[model samples]
Target: GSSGSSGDEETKAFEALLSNIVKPVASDIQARTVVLTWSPPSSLINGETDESSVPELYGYEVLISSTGKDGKYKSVYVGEETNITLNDLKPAMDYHAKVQAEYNSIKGTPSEAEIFTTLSCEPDIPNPPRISGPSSG
Candidate 1:
């Protein structure tokens, strides 16, 4: 005869919630273009859990606004890449950019806005004509 024994039950939970990206930076600024980069979200969910269990990232969305943070924003880029080069921006203008992580067709909260200014546009000066020979003394 054997004693009645049962195995312990285990329970686990998983979440698909995505978190905002971190430390968005803008560089290579130009008159009408600039490069933006950022790190992945600190965690997939707001709750504390193992990152190994986190869901796979689908992509990200980058938004930009010429006005303040509360102003209207437009989508500049959307993909799995961590960086993007924004073009067709106005010169000598201030801009605010934000990033959001996407998971399972769900977009997470936007990251802190990154503020930067585009370089001023300047007219190119024409080069002086070269002399055929040395000027007579």
Candidate 2:
């Protein structure tokens, strides 16, 4: 869900992920699809998440694209967990992943909740997010 807020690229990648990587993984993993989640981008910049500072966002929407020839992505899993386990992923195949932080404009700045991918074989893992903001309805 990136590419710098370019609707052209964002939509294209979003669709590709669902069709290619996400669909196949779902079938093999015996899942209909994945769920996604994100907190608004933390620290507002001009009343919105800078989009470049996505790294600051904590929650994530899991995006997947397979190792197929097309090299495109599948679908998106939204409102999911910060740490999710791929129940039925193909162990041998390599997959690509990224996280998203939601930023609703309620407090003049975007608040963030983030998600990260599961560990591959329990060795390669990245650090997570830390958020401090106000969310009210």
Candidate 3:
């Protein structure tokens, strides 16, 4: 018999093992609902949404809120469907966005949310060049 007492070493070794794995794992890993986005395979493979447009689209969710300049985001409206557009968006402020896919009628896991900056207003496009006549002088 090494030691009919098991000594104090048994307790110390057990404590060390718990501290390294158990405590750390609990704190480090937790369930967090993160914003996710993705583009449909149809769009990725084919071009525009013309002859081969996925009517349902890749589908998307919109968070109608603010994303600060520092990249921190907060949303009031969380959408989960095909194409949710946020109305009454603030002017000059930046916004964060995320979209998901519904591929082959199967709702796939959400993709990572990406950030996009919006313009204050839709830009005014110039008129087409007037190609009416040659030098008629």
Candidate 4:
């Protein structure tokens, strides 16, 4: 059988496969959650959501980290849901998030790091009016 393998060949194949994956995109960075999204690896003419296609990828791994004074990190795995909401984040801080498409029971290269600042939770308030001094005509 022609099923023999080589070290160099396997390495090259692994790198090539990862290069085809589409990086995840981040949006709606709120005080408590961030939205991570991506498409099927090298997929074509596909509707939204990876599941719509024929399982090009098993799912995704979401990586999140607080890049500000908070200093926190979190990672989670989810199904074919192309867009996932990562909740329970710190407010008024910067966060880095990324996603990796998985295949063959392993995760591939991660997407570009999404640097985003979370919105503030406090409400804006107006200052109290000051007393005006008497003016001389």
- Candidate 4 whole-model C-alpha lDDT, 0 to 1: 0.61
Error of 3 at 64 (Å): 4.6
TM-score per candidate? 0.66, 0.31, 0.30, 0.60
Model 1 misplacement above 4 A: 1-17, 44-56, 123-137
State which candidate has the highest lDDT. Answer: 1
Ranking by lDDT: 1, 4, 2, 3
lDDT of 3 by residue, 64-98 (tens): 33644345444433333432344455544544553
Local distance difference test scores for all models: 0.68, 0.36, 0.35, 0.61
Per-residue lDDT of 80 in model 1: 81
Among all windows of ten consecutive residues in candidate 4, which has the lowest summed lDDT? 122-131
Q: Which segments of candidate 4 are over 4 A away from where they belong?
A: 1-15, 43-54, 68-73, 123-137
Candidate 2 versus truth, CA RMSD in Å, comes to 14.8
Q: Model 2 over residues 1-137: C-alpha lDDT tens digits? A: 64565455434433332222121112112122233322232232344445564333233355555554236645455443444534444443445544443323111211221222333544343432333586686
**Candidate 3 wrongly placed segments (more than 4 Å):** 1-38, 41-59, 68-85, 102-108, 121-137
lDDT score, candidate 4, position 1: 65
Q: In model 3, which range of ten residues has the least summed lDDT?
A: 21-30
Residue 38's lDDT within candidate 3 is 30
Model 1 poorest 10 in a row by lDDT = 7-16
